Paper text:
Mammals obtain nitrogen via the uptake of di- and tri-peptides in the gastrointestinal tract through the action of PepT1 and PepT2, which are members of the POT family of proton-coupled oligopeptide transporters. However, a key structural difference exists between bacterial and mammalian homologs with only the latter containing a large extracellular domain, the function of which is currently unknown. Here, we present the crystal structure of the extracellular domain from both PepT1 and PepT2 that reveal two immunoglobulin-like folds connected in tandem, providing structural insight into mammalian peptide transport. Functional and biophysical studies demonstrate that these domains interact with the intestinal protease trypsin, suggesting a role in clustering proteolytic activity to the site of peptide transport in eukaryotic cells.
Residue numbers in the entry: 408 to 601
Amino acid sequence: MAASQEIFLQVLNLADGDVKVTVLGSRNNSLLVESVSSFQNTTHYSKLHLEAKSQDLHFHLKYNSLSVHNDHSVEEKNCYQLLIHQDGESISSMLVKDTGIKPANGMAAIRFINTLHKDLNISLDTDAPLSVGKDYGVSAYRTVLRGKYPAVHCETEDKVFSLDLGQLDFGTTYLFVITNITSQGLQAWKAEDI
């Protein structure tokens, strides 16, 4: 997907307010400047130019008055998702690498990020459950039949929930961030890999 000394970056802002993102290179060079709204539901990707085949980029995040600096290592020819999340009264970021999954006739592919304090097991299919670890753990990708997933089984050490993953389309790789437990049950934010 991405070329030499190049990356694609998708910013997911899971904070309660807007965040201004400033990605910097090895010499105060602004590789990306973008403000993303709280749960901005966009399938938009930014191409970033690197100085080498591998680089540590500096992510400058602005949220309310607060400023947070996070470093994240990237590599050429790759696509990433920057998950900006709440860190108390402040915010923090995580960089998730995307695997390129060639479309499989009749199939979609899925992956989860667990923001809960308890580990999770998701029943997507007739095989093994999909494990997704507590405190921003990342699940494996699972190739699933295309279709509607209105009540996917989730379970912690002590409860079992339902998630509405909605329609999962062929030729699409999804990312689901398990945000909170409301009165209505478990909540999941849907995003699409590039």
